[model samples]
Target: KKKCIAKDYGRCKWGGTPCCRGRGCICSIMGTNCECKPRLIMEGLGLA
Candidate 1:
């Protein structure tokens, strides 16, 4: 099974508003906004 480690705070590339869930990174192409799970922490840094 896969896991969702990140999500785009904006829209998705495959055609979804807000965002979608999945494995690996889900950051938009424009780098609008995004989030990463605590397990994959990168404190004091921007993801999108």
Candidate 2:
């Protein structure tokens, strides 16, 4: 799907912008669509 945006894959570890630290990431690779698991604090922060 074309649901992904430029910010999805634009970061690394701490102090850096994350790909999907809370809301999760939806991506497609070689025709396969996958979702990255959300962080544990996601629900607590209302970002899940």
Candidate 3:
């Protein structure tokens, strides 16, 4: 599949999604389409 966009949520960890550009793949859900969230809490907190 193509790279994971905001809506096109893709796999994470190991050989997984490419949510780069200040984003990190967070594989915390069912299926292979793990979510793409902040790389750190600081970013999540709007500090990054």
Candidate 4:
């Protein structure tokens, strides 16, 4: 979650920082656990 920590692979219109794009911004909201991107969710579900 820190700078340059690299978040595996994700699409973020906000420069891939903080939160992921198209997966809802869990990071941007306060007190929300940083959830993985939609791509990751799709990967987990074998649909990515």
Candidate 5:
């Protein structure tokens, strides 16, 4: 359920579950739980 995928909370009106790799699907208020928070990657070479 990655934190999104429950065709029950309003017939998945909120949004289908499908957030993998990195992470992203912020949406909930009282009937959607999966805990989501992870999307950040950067390691530039910063050529100098």
Candidate 6:
């Protein structure tokens, strides 16, 4: 209900219904994205 709630991720998933997912994860914020999946993290940023 407040301005900031990490669990909500702006729009609270329920209020907007399209801004968030129930996966309890963050994909992109404000158009910033990463080229990696959970298991592919190491392979993307040169860690692989």
Residue-level lDDT tens digits of model 3 in 1-48? 356444323355547546543355666656465655544434344554
Q: Compare candidates 2 and 3 on TM-score and give the better one.
A: 3
Q: Rank the candidates by lDDT, best first.
A: 3, 4, 5, 2, 1, 6
Q: Of models 1 and 4, which has the larger TM-score?
A: 4
The positional error of residue 23 in candidate 5, measured at the CA in angstroms, is: 0.9
Q: lDDT tens digits, residues 14-46, model 1? A: 333322243223555564343332322343334
The best candidate by TM-score is: 3
TM for candidate 5 is 0.21
Each prediction's Cα lDDT score?
0.34, 0.39, 0.50, 0.42, 0.41, 0.31
Model 4 agreement with the true structure over 1-48: per-residue lDDT tens digits:
454323533333344555433354344354344443554444334554
Compute each candidate's TM-score over C-alphas: 0.17, 0.22, 0.33, 0.21, 0.21, 0.16
Model 3: which ten-residue window has the lowest total lDDT? Answer: 1-10
Task: State each candidate's clash count.
Answer: 0, 0, 0, 0, 1, 0
Give me the runs in candidate 4 sitting further than 4 Å from their true place. Answer: 8-17, 20-24, 27-30, 40-48
Q: What value of lDDT does candidate 1 attain over all alpha carbons?
A: 0.34
lDDT of 6 by residue, 1-48 (tens): 343232333433333223211223244665433112233223324453
Clashes of 6: 0
lDDT of 2 by residue, 12-47 (tens): 333233343333444455323444445545434644
For candidate 6, the 10 contiguous residues with the lowest summed lDDT are 16-25
User: Which residue pairs show collisions in model 2?
Assistant: none
lDDT (tens digit, per residue) of candidate 5 on 1-48: 556442322222236565443344455676465333444341122332
Lowest summed-lDDT stretch of 10 residues in model 2? Answer: 1-10
> What is residue 24's positional error in candidate 3, in angstroms?
1.5
